[PDB]
Amino acid sequence: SITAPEQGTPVGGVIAEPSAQMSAAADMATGKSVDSEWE
Amino acid sequence: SITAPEQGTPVGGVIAEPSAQMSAAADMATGKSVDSEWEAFFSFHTSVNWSTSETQGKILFKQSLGPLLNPYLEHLAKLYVAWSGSIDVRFSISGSGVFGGKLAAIVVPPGVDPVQSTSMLQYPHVLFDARQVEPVIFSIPDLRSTLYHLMSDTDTTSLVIMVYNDLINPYANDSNSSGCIVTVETKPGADFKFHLLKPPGSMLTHGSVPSDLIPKSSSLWIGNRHWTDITDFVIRPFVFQANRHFDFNQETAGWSTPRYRPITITISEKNGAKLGIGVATDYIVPGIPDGWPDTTIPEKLTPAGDYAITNKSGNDITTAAGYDGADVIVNNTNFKGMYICGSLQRAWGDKKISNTAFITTATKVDNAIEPSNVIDMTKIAVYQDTHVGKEVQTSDDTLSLLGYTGIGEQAIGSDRDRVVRISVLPETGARGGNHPIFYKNSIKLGYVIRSIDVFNSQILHTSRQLSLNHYLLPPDSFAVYRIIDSNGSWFDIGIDSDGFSFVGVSSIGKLEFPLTASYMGIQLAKIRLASNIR
Amino acid sequence: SITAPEQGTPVGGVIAEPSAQMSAAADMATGKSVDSEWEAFFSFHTSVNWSTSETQGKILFKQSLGPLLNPYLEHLAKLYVAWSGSIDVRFSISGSGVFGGKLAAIVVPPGVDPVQSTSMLQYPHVLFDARQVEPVIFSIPDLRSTLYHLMSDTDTTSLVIMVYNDLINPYANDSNSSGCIVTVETKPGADFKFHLLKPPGSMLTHGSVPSDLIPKSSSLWIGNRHWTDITDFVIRPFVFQANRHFDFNQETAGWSTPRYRPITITISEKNGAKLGIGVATDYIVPGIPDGWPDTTIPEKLTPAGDYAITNKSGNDITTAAGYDGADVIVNNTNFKGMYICGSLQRAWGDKKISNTAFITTATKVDNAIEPSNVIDMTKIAVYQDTHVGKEVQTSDDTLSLLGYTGIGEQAIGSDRDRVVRISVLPETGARGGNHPIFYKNSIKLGYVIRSIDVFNSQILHTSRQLSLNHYLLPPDSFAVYRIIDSNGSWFDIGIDSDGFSFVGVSSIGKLEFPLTASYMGIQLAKIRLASNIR
Amino acid sequence: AFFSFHTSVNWSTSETQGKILFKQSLGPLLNPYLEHLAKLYVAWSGSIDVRFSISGSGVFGGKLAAIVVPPGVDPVQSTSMLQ
Ligand SMILES: [K+]
Ligand SMILES: [K+]
């Protein structure tokens, strides 16, 4: 009955998958900090 | 000495070689699992309506086996001579647990002409209900006498859906049929395999599907009989046209082609003849020009003078309020049911610049004409003054269909007896619960500013593509297209092999004409189409 | 409930199931044990001749990486969007053993455009001799800045052969000249994957690939200035047109549309005014009727009466021998440079036969007209004898382009002083060695039955598609379509973003016109277009 | 770590088999928090999640269909996308 703030049925990426080998590629080109750069 | 289809000594990309580490990064971008994606999901094929009226022993769906049931295969069948194997066809009913009505499903062996009869259920039938949750599959097998089929074979397994319990819904009406639609989807199946590769050239390229038979808008649309735009759809239980009415066999009873070009003819006279027997200069049928129209005169008449119309049978009137302010209209004219072509009216050594023409089919007798509708090389008719004194003229001419004369009339293409056919008139009646239609198209009138309403069987663009491209359809099905007026309403249209449009509603009325069109799929002919109005 | 791209409860074939014992029998007949054969057998792509006259530093072969180097891949790319990985390019050669000569091979990186000079050899190169026996491979890697490519990517790796050391026939004199050949084949490689499956019938966002601008056959061809069929091509250094010249930005500077319909207008003549100023009724630009032509009167003149010609003081022709035998046809007529316009000419009271019309763009001066090669709402001009009697008429009208009356002139469109722009005259000179072309059309004439020529920048269908369908063409590039007559004489046409065609030869001559047009691809305007003539 | 409202539609009765109810290319604009932060960056990378809720608690029949079209295409208002 209730649906909570983060409650749903994950079917997800139908054709693909939100990979992780890729996001770190964007990271290494631009560098990072702990989710903030104005500190 | 010999070298095989792969042999050859390698040296490799000299500055660098192909790095698999690179190509993996491409697969890292996508979710590239494996090629041949089409073997791992479903594809839309069509969608069939199922109204209240579909009494049982009446079919919805019927498709033989083959690759054409999944276009990804249809694109690859051009590379392989032969194929073999199964095919899975998904099913799914609209109406989410709301409706009733079981629905059968039969695979038949090859070599049959199925029938809308319950005897088809004297056979192993699977049933499923309109309260279906999970869609349904029905893996078709490939039953055959030969090791591998070809692309041309037809004697194959074939699936059918037929009704087993008529539905129930209190949420529909006799006119519209919004509701049940039976989506069908396909997938090749595990054992499916092409066979016997071929080089391109050959790439035969047949299997053309109806997808461009109509544009996706109105402003491109024009009737085949007359050049003006469409503004309305008209129903009539019968239907008839021959001039440009083309069928999927890429032929007709029509002397004409689907191009609104002018008409070149070399009329000839002796002394003072206004009228003469126009003769061909371009044609496809001997004697008859291309683009030549189809409507006879109503009656015998001696074309000899000017326009004249009279209200009340007691007057003569030359203005709008007198036109509308009229008991009736009489048309005491001598070229009544005629046309208004342009008539460049050339000749050798003939000044006295071109005048306007007036043309129909009719049989000419020495000063007059009479309606004949069986057109031949003699029935052509003209009434342009080419300035002929006492000598043969040899007047070449060109003519472009441009208007009408028969004021008092209120439509064209409604009296079949006046329609010009060579010998045969294509014609249909209602089918399933669907009915024919015409496409209305306003037209000029001549002396009076008003217009009048034509009936048309075919958009030109429809009739052009049939002239050329070998589209595929069985004899007893449509090539359904959809229509959406700009009020959000909609209705569907079917197209038989003959070319006659068909519809499923009882009425249309007024509608937001700036509308669109799209292609849903194929539908068996003998079923009421879908609709939703207001 | 929530069903996935494959989810569905199975039931199986009801009478049978796919018997995998069967399908092996198909694999038993054929050699079908493996899919994707094209990854393991070479394929012709082209062939080359190499002779003693071809000196050192010449470039024989030059092809860029892509799928098109193996037409199987050219056929499968239509499903997909992207590609990544390498290609193999087999080289095979057979020389006598007495011959010599060494022949190079270079993969070059992207971004470059090679040059027929030895400085290209100041770079890693692999050689091989005409005595070579076993074929050679030269895997072409993919050296790219992106994770993958689309199909519209030319900035790729590429390959070249070049004549390192020339060919030697010791027995041959220096006068006679022999030469071996070189055959090339390809294969996709191993790391060569496509990507990013396309859902048909999608519309790629940057635009589709132009392969329908020109209809293949001829009979579908008509020009963008007059409806008559093409018959021949015409070269000019300069070209220009605005009436229907639509670029790949789907716009123009014109006023008209790609439909040869009639032209409704209204006209408000008073006293005996044969002429007037017709006003707009249907358009896309305010105050200009759609489909209106683009050509001024050559000179000022007084529209008065009927035709007039001469034979230099003054023996008027009234036949063919005088005309075709005449020297000049000076055309003393007083309505010279106008079209002919079939002329319905309705109104209240004009119970007449709708005399014929003549038009141009020009300013009236109280009885007559002055040329003006810019259209406004005013330049529109008429001469059609509306049967006026100081009983102000206000006739509605509708016309049709048929011929022309400026007898003896050159073909229309070769005089920008006359042509009717608004503000901008679209135009090109040449680009590279490739020259423009008009398309010719025979157009009709009024008095003498002969016909004059027209110039057309574009086929109509070439212009219709650009009104609608957003395409890709980098402005430095061409869309290359290939022509073949009945004999076999071919030449390639180029088409620019603007729309003006181009060709890579100074003349054509005569050819069996039932010709066709085929697609080849994109090519850079900085390069000449090919031609095999006679 | 939660879901954020974006918009709302009206899948009324007069809509048919092939219409589109929603179509948005990827970006921060699918969440009004992220859009307020895209002003502080010139870049992004990664998936976004979505959630729907239809208001037919158990009544309204009828279903929808979703597609993840790739980058480069520009989908159309027909059924063909369901191939
Ligand atoms: K004449
Ligand atoms: K009149």
From Swiss-Prot, chain A:
Sequence similarity: Belongs to the caliciviridae capsid protein family.
Highest rank taxon of the organism: Viruses
Protein name according to UniProt: Capsid protein VP1
Shown chain mapped onto the complete sequence: 129 to 167 of 671
SS bonds (residue pairs): none
